[PDB]
Amino acid sequence: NEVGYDDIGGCRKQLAQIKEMVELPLRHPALFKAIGVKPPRGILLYGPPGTGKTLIARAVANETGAFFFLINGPEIMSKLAGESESNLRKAFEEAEKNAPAIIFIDELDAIAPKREKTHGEVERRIVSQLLTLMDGLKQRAHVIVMAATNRPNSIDPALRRFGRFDREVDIGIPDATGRLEILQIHTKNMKLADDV
Amino acid sequence: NRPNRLIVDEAINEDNSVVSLSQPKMDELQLFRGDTVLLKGKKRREAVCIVLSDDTCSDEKIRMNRVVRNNLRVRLGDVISIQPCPDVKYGKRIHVLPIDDTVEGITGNLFEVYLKPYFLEAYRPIRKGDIFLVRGGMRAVEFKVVETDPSPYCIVAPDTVIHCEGEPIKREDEEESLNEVGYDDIGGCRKQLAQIKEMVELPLRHPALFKAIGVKPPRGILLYGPPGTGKTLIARAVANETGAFFFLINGPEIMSKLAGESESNLRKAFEEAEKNAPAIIFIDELDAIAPKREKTHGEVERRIVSQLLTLMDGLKQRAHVIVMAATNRPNSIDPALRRFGRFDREVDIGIPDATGRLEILQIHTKNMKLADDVDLEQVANETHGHVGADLAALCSEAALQAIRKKMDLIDLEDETIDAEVMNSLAVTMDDFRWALSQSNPSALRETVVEVPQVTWEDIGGLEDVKRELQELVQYPVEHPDKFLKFGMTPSKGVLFYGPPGCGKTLLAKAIANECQANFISIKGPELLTMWFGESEANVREIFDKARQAAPCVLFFDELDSIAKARGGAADRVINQILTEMDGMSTKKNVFIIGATNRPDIIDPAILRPGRLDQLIYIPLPDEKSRVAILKANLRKSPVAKDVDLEFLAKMTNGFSGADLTEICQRACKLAIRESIESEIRPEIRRDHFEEAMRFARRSVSDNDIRKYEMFAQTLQQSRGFG
Amino acid sequence: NEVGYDDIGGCRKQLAQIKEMVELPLRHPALFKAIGVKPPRGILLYGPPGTGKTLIARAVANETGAFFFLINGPEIMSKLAGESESNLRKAFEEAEKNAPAIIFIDELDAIAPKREKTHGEVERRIVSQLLTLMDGLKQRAHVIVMAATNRPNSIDPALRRFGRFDREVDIGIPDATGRLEILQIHTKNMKLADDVDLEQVANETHGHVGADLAALCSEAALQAIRKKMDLIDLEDETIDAEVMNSLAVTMDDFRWALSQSNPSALRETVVEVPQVTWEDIGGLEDVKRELQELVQYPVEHPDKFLKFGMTPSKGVLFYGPPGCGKTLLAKAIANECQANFISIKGPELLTMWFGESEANVREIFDKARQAAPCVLFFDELDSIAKARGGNGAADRVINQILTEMDGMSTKKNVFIIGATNRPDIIDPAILRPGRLDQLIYIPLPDEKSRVAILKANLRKSPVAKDVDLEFLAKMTNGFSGADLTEICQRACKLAIRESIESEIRPEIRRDHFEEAMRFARRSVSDNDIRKYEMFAQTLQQSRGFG
Numbered sequence A: 001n002e003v004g005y006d007d008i009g010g011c012r013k014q015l016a017q018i019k020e021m022v023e024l025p026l027r028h029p030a031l032f033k034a035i036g037v038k039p040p041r042g043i044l045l046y047g048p049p050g051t052g053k054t055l056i057a058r059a060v061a062n063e064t065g066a067f068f069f070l071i072n073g074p075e076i077m078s079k080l081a082g083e084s085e086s087n088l089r090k091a092f093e094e095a096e097k098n099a100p101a102i103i104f105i106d107e108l109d110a111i112a113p114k115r116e117k118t119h120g121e122v123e124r125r126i127v128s129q130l131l132t133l134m135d136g137l138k139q140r141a142h143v144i145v146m147a148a149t150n151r152p153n154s155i156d157p158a159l160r161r162f163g164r165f166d167r168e169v170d171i172g173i174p175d176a177t178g179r180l181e182i183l184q185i186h187t188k189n190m191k192l193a194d195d196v
Numbered sequence B: 001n002r003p004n005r006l007i008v009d010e011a012i013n014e015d016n017s018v019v020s021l022s023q024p025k026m027d028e029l030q031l032f033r034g035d036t037v038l039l040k041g042k043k044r045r046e047a048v049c050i051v052l053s054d055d056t057c058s059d060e061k062i063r064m065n066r067v068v069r070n071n072l073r074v075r076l077g078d079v080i081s082i083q084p085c086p087d088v089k090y091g092k093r094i095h096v097l098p099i100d101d102t103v104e105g106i107t108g109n110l111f112e113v114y115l116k117p118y119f120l121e122a123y124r125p126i127r128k129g130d131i132f133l134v135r136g137g138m139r140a141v142e143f144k145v146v147e148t149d150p151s152p153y154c155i156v157a158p159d160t161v162i163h164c165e166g167e168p169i170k171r172e173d174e175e176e177s178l179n180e181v182g183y184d185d186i187g188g189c190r191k192q193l194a195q196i197k198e199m200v201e202l203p204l205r206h207p208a209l210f211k212a213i214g215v216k217p218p219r220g221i222l223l224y225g226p227p228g229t230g231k232t233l234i235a236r237a238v239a240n241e242t243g244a245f246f247f248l249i250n251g252p253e254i255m256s257k258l259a260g261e262s263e264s265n266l267r268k269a270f271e272e273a274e275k276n277a278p279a280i281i282f283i284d285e286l287d288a289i290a291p292k293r294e295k296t297h298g299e300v301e302r303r304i305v306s307q308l309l310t311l312m313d314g315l316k317q318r319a320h321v322i323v324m325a326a327t328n329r330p331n332s333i334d335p336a337l338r339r340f341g342r343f344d345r346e347v348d349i350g351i352p353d354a355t356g357r358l359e360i361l362q363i364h365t366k367n368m369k370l371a372d373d374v375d376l377e378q379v380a381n382e383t384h385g386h387v388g389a390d391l392a393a394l395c396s397e398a399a400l401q402a403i404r405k406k407m408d409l410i411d412l413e414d415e416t417i418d419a420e421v422m423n424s425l426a427v428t429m430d431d432f433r434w435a436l437s438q439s440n441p442s443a444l445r446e447t448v449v450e451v452p453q454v455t456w457e458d459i460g461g462l463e464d465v466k467r468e469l470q471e472l473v474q475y476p477v478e479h480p481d482k483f484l485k486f487g488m489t490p491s492k493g494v495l496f497y498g499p500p501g502c503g504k505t506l507l508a509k510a511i512a513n514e515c516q517a518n519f520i521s522i523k524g525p526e527l528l529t530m531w532f533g534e535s536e537a538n539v540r541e542i543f544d545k546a547r548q549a550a551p552c553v554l555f556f557d558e559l560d561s562i563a564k565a566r567g568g569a570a571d572r573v574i575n576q577i578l579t580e581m582d583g584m585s586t587k588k589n590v591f592i593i594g595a596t597n598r599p600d601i602i603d604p605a606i607l608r609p610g611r612l613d614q615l616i617y618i619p620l621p622d623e624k625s626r627v628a629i630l631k632a633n634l635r636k637s638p639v640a641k642d643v644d645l646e647f648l649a650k651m652t653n654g655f656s657g658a659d660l661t662e663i664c665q666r667a668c669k670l671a672i673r674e675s676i677e678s679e680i681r682p683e684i685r686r687d688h689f690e691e692a693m694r695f696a697r698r699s700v701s702d703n704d705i706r707k708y709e710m711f712a713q714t715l716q717q718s719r720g721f722g
Numbered sequence C: 001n002e003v004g005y006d007d008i009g010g011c012r013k014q015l016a017q018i019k020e021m022v023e024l025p026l027r028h029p030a031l032f033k034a035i036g037v038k039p040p041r042g043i044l045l046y047g048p049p050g051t052g053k054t055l056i057a058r059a060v061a062n063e064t065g066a067f068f069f070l071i072n073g074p075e076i077m078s079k080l081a082g083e084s085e086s087n088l089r090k091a092f093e094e095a096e097k098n099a100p101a102i103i104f105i106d107e108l109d110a111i112a113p114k115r116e117k118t119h120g121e122v123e124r125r126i127v128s129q130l131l132t133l134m135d136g137l138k139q140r141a142h143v144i145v146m147a148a149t150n151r152p153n154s155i156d157p158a159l160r161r162f163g164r165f166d167r168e169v170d171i172g173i174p175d176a177t178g179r180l181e182i183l184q185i186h187t188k189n190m191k192l193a194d195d196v197d198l199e200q201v202a203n204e205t206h207g208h209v210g211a212d213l214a215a216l217c218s219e220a221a222l223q224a225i226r227k228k229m230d231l232i233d234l235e236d237e238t239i240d241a242e243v244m245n246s247l248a249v250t251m252d253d254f255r256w257a258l259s260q261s262n263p264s265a266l267r268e269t270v271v272e273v274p275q276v277t278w279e280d281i282g283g284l285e286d287v288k289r290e291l292q293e294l295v296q297y298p299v300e301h302p303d304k305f306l307k308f309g310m311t312p313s314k315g316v317l318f319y320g321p322p323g324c325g326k327t328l329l330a331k332a333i334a335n336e337c338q339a340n341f342i343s344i345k346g347p348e349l350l351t352m353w354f355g356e357s358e359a360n361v362r363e364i365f366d367k368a369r370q371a372a373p374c375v376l377f378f379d380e381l382d383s384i385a386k387a388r389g390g391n392g393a394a395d396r397v398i399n400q401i402l403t404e405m406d407g408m409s410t411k412k413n414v415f416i417i418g419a420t421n422r423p424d425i426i427d428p429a430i431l432r433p434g435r436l437d438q439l440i441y442i443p444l445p446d447e448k449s450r451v452a453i454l455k456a457n458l459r460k461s462p463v464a465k466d467v468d469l470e471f472l473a474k475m476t477n478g479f480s481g482a483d484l485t486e487i488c489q490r491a492c493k494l495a496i497r498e499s500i501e502s503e504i505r506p507e508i509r510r511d512h513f514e515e516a517m518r519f520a521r522r523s524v525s526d527n528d529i530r531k532y533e534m535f536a537q538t539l540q541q542s543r544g545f546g
C-alpha cells in the first residue's frame, strides 16, 4: 500500500529525470566518494496543487530505500522561533546520520518565500538557517534535499543558487493521456462496469 | 644585478616539469631550450625542470606551474636563483609514494594508470623530496619522491625503473595541497583577475614596504557579477596564491544566528584577521548582511550594517588586512559601504565570452579522459548564456552520463572501483551533447559585454562606411598622438539610418571587432521592457557597464520602436540616455552608435552636436555589393559551380541585404528538401535559386526609397522646425 | 603631519565662513560671555561623499586648538539600545566639561534620518535624544556642534530649526581651480617630473572630488614606484631615502592613473565660473554688450539703478536657429562677470522621478541663490516643450520653474537665462513680464562672424598659410556656427588620415577644406530661417491668442 512509481501517472518523463538524478548517488555513495564528481544537492519540484509532488518525493524514497525525513513547511513555521530553526538543524543532522537519505521540504515557499515579501527578524533568520544547512551539504555526505512548491517564483532566489536547489523539475498538469493514466491507478481496486 | 635572479610568474606551459625563460635571457645564460636547469628557491629547497622559450614572458620573470612553485615554497611575486645543471644524468631507480588524502576512495594499480603514462617517454627531470601531480581517472593524485638512485636529482628515461614502496604517506604540515584553489583554476576572468592581483599583491606580499612609503592602499574590494561567476572562487584563490590568512565571513551564516551573535561574529572575524596579518577578510554574499537600509525594516538588521561599517572604518589600524566582499547585485548593497575608506574599489566579474567559456571547460575537463571526437571549442561556441558554475555542471553531467552507461555491469556490489576502469572510461562528444540538452543556463537574460565575432568580411559593400567608421572609432584609440597635436577632440557618437535590412546592426558589431573592443547592444524593445521605476537606474547601469568595459562601443539598435512608443515611459528613457550621453567624457573611449530604420521620427535631441552628430546613411546595396552579400551568406554553404551569383545580383536591383539572405535560405530550404526526400548528394544548385527567385520579395517599396534618399540629405535639419 | 587649513583646497570661501563663525566663540570665549550676544550653536556641513567634510572638521579643531569629541554616526547606531543614547549624553557632557569644545557628528544622517523614514522606536528615540542635547546647549558653555552629511534632505528637519543646526555650509564639488589646488596638496611630497602639467589634470578631471584626486595622486605614484621598483630588493624590510628621492612621477604615470579614474560625482549639478569667454564666440557683438547691460551693470553699479528708480529685468530668452552660440553666450556672460554658472538642460529635468522633479528644482534655485552672483541657465528648453504636447511631467516641472522664478526676489544677484531652438512652442507663461521678458534673437552668423568662428575653432589647430578662411566664410552663407565647426572637424579628420598614412607632419591644408566643403551641409533650411525671422518680431504676442 506504500507509495511507489507505479502509483504515479502523467509524470513519466519527469519521474524518469528524478530517477536519474537521484538513483545513482545513494547506492553508489561509496562510488561518488571514489569518483570525486559533484552530484545534485537540491531537486526543486514545482507545479500547481494536487499534481503529485509530495507523492513523487515519498515514492522516490521508498523505491530507492533511502532514509526519509519529511520537513513540512507550515509545521515548522507554526512553532516558536527556537523550535523552527532547531527542527531544521535536527532534520539535516538526523538525515546525515542515516545516509543515504532524502530530506523532503514540502511547501518550501512557507519557510523561504520571496525575501521582499518577508518581514520580521525570526522569519528572515529561518531562511538564512536553511541556506546555511543547504551549504552544509557541501561536506558531500550522501544526502539529497528534495523540495516542493506550488509557486517557483515565490521561493527566495537565494535557494536557487549553485550548490543549493540547483536542479528543478516542472511537474505540470497532466494531459489527456496522463489523466487516463491516473484514472487507471485509482480505479485499479474497483470493479468497473463494461459501459465505463 | 646578475642574470641568475628572476621573479616567479604564472605558467603558460601547463606541464609540471617545465619552466619558461625569454629568449633574450635564454641565450644570455648560454643555456638552451633543451637542457635541464636547477631551480633554487627559498626555505633552502630545490627543484629540477626543463627550461623553454616564451615570447610573452618578460625576461626578468620566470613562468613555472604551481606544482614547481609549491615545491620551492614560493608565491607569485618572489625571487629565485636559477642556474644550469649539466650535472644531471639518466635515472636508475625512483621511489615515489601517493599522499593519503589524494587517494582516499580508489585502490589498485597506480603504476599502470598514473605513473606509467606520466613518465612514458617523458624523460622527466625529477628531484628527491619533490611532489608532482598526475591527472587521470576523474581525479588528481599527488606523489612525493622519497628516493632516487642517482640521488637526489635524476632524469626518468624510458629505461628508468620506477618503484612504489608500499603504502600512501601522511601530509606534512608546511606542505600545501594542490587540490586547493589557485589562479590556475579560474578562467574567463583574465582582465579582472589581473586588476585584483595588482590591488592586493603589493600590500600583502610586502606589507613592510607599504608601511614605509606612507601611501594609502586599497581598503575594500567589492566583487559583483551574476551567480556562479566565480566570485567566491577568485577570493579563495587570491588568498592561497598570496598566502595571506583567510577569514571567511559567510553572509547567511551570520544572519542565521541570534541578534547579538551576528555582531559578535563580525568582531571576532576582524579581530582574528587583524591578529593574523597579513590577512584577507572575505565577506561572501554581502547583500545578506548589508542590503539597502531603506530595504530593511527591523532594528537588529540596521544595527548589524552599522557594525560592519564601523569595523570597515576601523582600518585606521591599517594592520595590513584587505576586506574583499562578494555580492550578486551592487544596488542591493547599502551605498554607505561604497564610500571612500570602505569598499572603494570594485571589480565587475561578468559572464564569460566564447573564449572564456572554452577556458573554463578546459579547467573542468582536466581530470577526465576526453574522447577524440570531443570539440570543446564547439561546446563553448554553442553556449551563449552559461556561467562558470553552469559549465562546471555541464562537464560534471556529461561525465555522469559516460559513467552511468559504461557502468553497464561494473560491480556496484563492490564498495569501490579501481583505477584501471576509471582511466579506460572515456567521455564522448555524445555525452556532452546530452549534458548540453539538459542545460539550464543561469544568465541568458544578462546583458552581454564582449568582442563581437562579426567581421568586415561578413558585410558586403559599404566599403565607404567601413572606412569612415575606422576614422571615428579606431583612430582616436590607436592614435591619440595625432588628435592631441591637431587640437581637435573626436566626435562621440554615430547614427545609422536608412531602409530596413541593409547592415546597420552588422556595422555596429563589425567595427567593435576591427578595434577588438567590447560591444554592448541594447535594442529599443529591451528599453521599453524595463520596469518603469527601475528603468532609470538600469540605464545608468548600462553606461557604467560600458564605461568600465572601455574601450567599448555602446550600440542602441532598433530605435524606431521607441520613437513609435513616444508619438510616457519611452520619454523618460531617451531623455535619460541624452543625459547619460552628455555625462560620457570624450576621453573615455566609449563610442555610442545609434541605429534606426526610421529617421522621420527620431528625437532631434539625439542628433544634437556632442551626441549622435555623425549621421551616416546606409542605403540599399548596388549590384557590386549585392554579389558581395550573396557570397558572404553562401560563404559557409556548399554551392554548385553552376550558380551565377553575379546574374542573381543583376535582376534584384531593389532588394535589401535581408532579402538576399532570405533568398539564399529559401534556395537552401529547397535543397534540403531534396536531400531528405531522395538522399541526393547534398548541394545547393541553380534550380533552387531560380525557383526561389521566381516568387521574389521586395521588402522595401519604391516610395520608401524616395523618402529615405530625401532624409539622407535633410536629416541634420530636423533640429529646427520639422 | 596633522591636519590644518593648509591641507584643504577648493573650499576657500566655505572654509572662510566656518572660520568666522567659530573663531570668535572659541578663541575668545570670555569676550562672548561679556557681550550677551548669541553665537552659532550648530554648523551643518553638506556636500557629496569625499569632498572633505570630516577633514575640515578635524582641521578646524586643531587650528583653533579646541577640545574635540568625535561622534561617529555608524558607530552609535551599531551599538545597543541605551548605550547609543548613553554615549550621546557622555559626548556632550565631556565636551561641555572641557570647554571650549567642538562636537563633530560625522554622518549625521545615520543617527537622525527623516523621522518619518525611520521604522521602530529606539531609532526615533535617539533622534529625540539628540534634539534634547542640542536644546540642552542653553547652558551655552561655549560648545559648538559641527556635523557632516551627504544627505542634506534626509536629516530630520527638526534638527535644522533655530537653536540647533541653524547654520549650514555647502561644501560642494570643486571646480577647475579647486581641483588644481588639491592636486598640489597631495603632490606636495612627490618629486614631479617637468612634463607634469597639473593644470591639464585639473581641467580634464571634471567629476572628481577631494578624495578622488587624493587617490589619483596616490595612483600615479604607486605606478611610478612599481616601475623603478624593477629590481629594488623587496627582500629587505625597508627602502632607504636615497632611492625615494631618485623616484620621479612622470606625466605618463598621471595619465595611467587617469585611465583607471572612476569619478565619484558626475551629473552632480556643477556650480562654477565658466572657462568660456567672448573670444570663443564669433560675432554677436551687439548681443554681447546687451548681455553686459543686463548682467554686468546691476551687480557692479547698483547705485545707478536705485537712483534711476527702475528695477532691472530678471531673465533672458535666447531663441533662434540651432547651433548659433546660445549655450556659449550664457556661459560667456557669466564668465565676464566672473559669476557662478549653473546649466540645467531640458532632458535633465525630464530624467527625475515624478516626486523628486519638484523637490529637486527647488534645490537648483537654492543652489543658484547661494552661489550668487550666479547665472542660472535653462538650456535645451525645446526638448521639454515637446514632452508636454508631443510637438505630464514636463508640465509639472515648468510650472515649478515658473513658481520658483516669481518667488526669487529681484534684489538677489541670480540671473536666469532660458534658451531654445524653437520659439513656436515655448510656454507663453515664461515670456510674461517679470520672468524671461528679455527676448533676444540669435540668428545665423553673418559673413564677418563666420570668419571669426572659423578662426576661433582653428585657433589651437595647425592650419596652413595658403588656407583662406575669409573665402571659406564667403562660401558658407546659410551655415551655422555648429556647421562651421563640423566643417573644420571634417577637414581636420582628413588631415589626420594623411598624417597616419604618410607621416607628413600635421598640416590641415587647403585641399582638406575643399573636400570637406564638397560634402558640406546646411543644417538650417531656408524655410526654417523665414520662420525664425517671423518669431524675431511676433514672439512678443505669444501670450495672447496667437
Ligand SMILES: Nc1ncnc2c1ncn2[C@@H]1O[C@H](COP(=O)(O)OP(=O)(O)OP(O)(O)=S)[C@@H](O)[C@H]1O
Pocket (backbone or CB within 6 Å): A007, A008, A009, A010, A011, A048, A049, A050, A051, A052, A053, A054, A055, A056, A148, A149, A150, A182, A185
Ligand atoms: N501523477 C499522479 N498520479 C496518481 N495520483 C496522483 C498524481 N498526482 C497527484 N495524485 C493524487 O493526489 C493526491 C496527492 O497529491 P499531492 O502530491 O499530495 O499534491 P501536491 O502535488 O503535493 O500538491 P500540494 O501543493 O501539496 S496541494 C493523492 O491522492 C494522489 O493519488
Ligand SMILES: Nc1ncnc2c1ncn2[C@@H]1O[C@H](COP(=O)(O)OP(=O)(O)OP(O)(O)=S)[C@@H](O)[C@H]1O
Pocket (backbone or CB within 6 Å): A161, A162, B185, B186, B187, B188, B189, B226, B227, B228, B229, B230, B231, B232, B233, B234, B326, B327, B328, B360, B363, B387, B388, B389, B390, B392
Ligand atoms: N570563473 C570560473 N572559472 C572556472 N570555474 C568556475 C568559475 N566560476 C565558477 N566556476 C565553477 O563553479 C563553481 C562556483 O563558483 P562560485 O565561486 O561559488 O561562484 P559564485 O559567484 O561565488 O556563486 P555565488 O556568488 O555564491 S551565487 C566553482 O567552484 C567552479 O567549480
Ligand SMILES: Nc1ncnc2c1ncn2[C@@H]1O[C@H](COP(=O)(O)OP(=O)(O)OP(O)(O)=S)[C@@H](O)[C@H]1O
Pocket (backbone or CB within 6 Å): B458, B459, B460, B461, B462, B499, B500, B501, B502, B503, B504, B505, B506, B507, B597, B629, B632, B656, B657, B658, B659, B661
Ligand atoms: N551588407 C550586408 N552583408 C551581409 N548581410 C547583410 C547585409 N545587409 C543586411 N544583411 C542581412 O540582413 C540581416 C540584418 O542585418 P542588419 O544589420 O540588422 O540590417 P538592419 O539595417 O539592422 O535592418 P533590420 O531592421 O535589422 S532587418 C543580417 O542578418 C544580414 O544577414
Ligand SMILES: Nc1ncnc2c1ncn2[C@@H]1O[C@H](COP(=O)(O)OP(=O)(O)OP(O)(O)=S)[C@@H](O)[C@H]1O
Pocket (backbone or CB within 6 Å): B339, B340, C007, C008, C009, C010, C011, C048, C049, C050, C051, C052, C053, C054, C055, C056, C148, C149, C150, C182, C185, C209, C210, C211, C212, C214
Ligand atoms: N577639499 C580637500 N582638500 C584636500 N584633500 C581632500 C579634500 N577633500 C577630500 N580630501 C581627501 O579625501 C579624503 C576624504 O576624507 P574625508 O574628510 O572623510 O571626506 P568626507 O567628505 O568626510 O568623506 P565622506 O563624506 O564621509 S564619504 C581626505 O582624507 C583627503 O585626503
Ligand SMILES: Nc1ncnc2c1ncn2[C@@H]1O[C@H](COP(=O)(O)OP(=O)(O)OP(O)(O)=S)[C@@H](O)[C@H]1O
Pocket (backbone or CB within 6 Å): B608, B609, B719, C280, C281, C282, C283, C284, C321, C322, C323, C324, C325, C326, C327, C328, C329, C421, C445, C453, C456, C480, C481, C482, C483, C485
Ligand atoms: N557663435 C559661435 N562661435 C563659435 N562657435 C559656435 C558659435 N555658435 C555655435 N558654435 C558651435 O556650435 C557649438 C554649440 O554652440 P551652442 O551655443 O550650443 O549653439 P546652440 O544655439 O545652443 O545650438 P545647439 O542646438 O546647442 S548645437 C559650439 O560648441 C561651437 O562649436
Ligand SMILES: [Cl-]
Pocket (backbone or CB within 6 Å): B559, B562, B563, B574, B601, B602, B603
Ligand atoms: Cl527617438
Ligand SMILES: [Cl-]
Pocket (backbone or CB within 6 Å): C381, C384, C385, C398, C425, C426, C427
Ligand atoms: Cl515650454
Ligand SMILES: [Mg+2]
Pocket (backbone or CB within 6 Å): A053, A054, A055, A106, A148
Ligand atoms: Mg504536497
Ligand SMILES: [Mg+2]
Pocket (backbone or CB within 6 Å): B231, B232, B233, B284, B326
Ligand atoms: Mg559564492
Ligand SMILES: [Mg+2]
Pocket (backbone or CB within 6 Å): B504, B505, B506, B557
Ligand atoms: Mg538590425
Ligand SMILES: [Mg+2]
Pocket (backbone or CB within 6 Å): C053, C054, C055, C106, C107, C148
Ligand atoms: Mg566623512
Ligand SMILES: [Mg+2]
Pocket (backbone or CB within 6 Å): C326, C327, C328, C379
Ligand atoms: Mg547649445
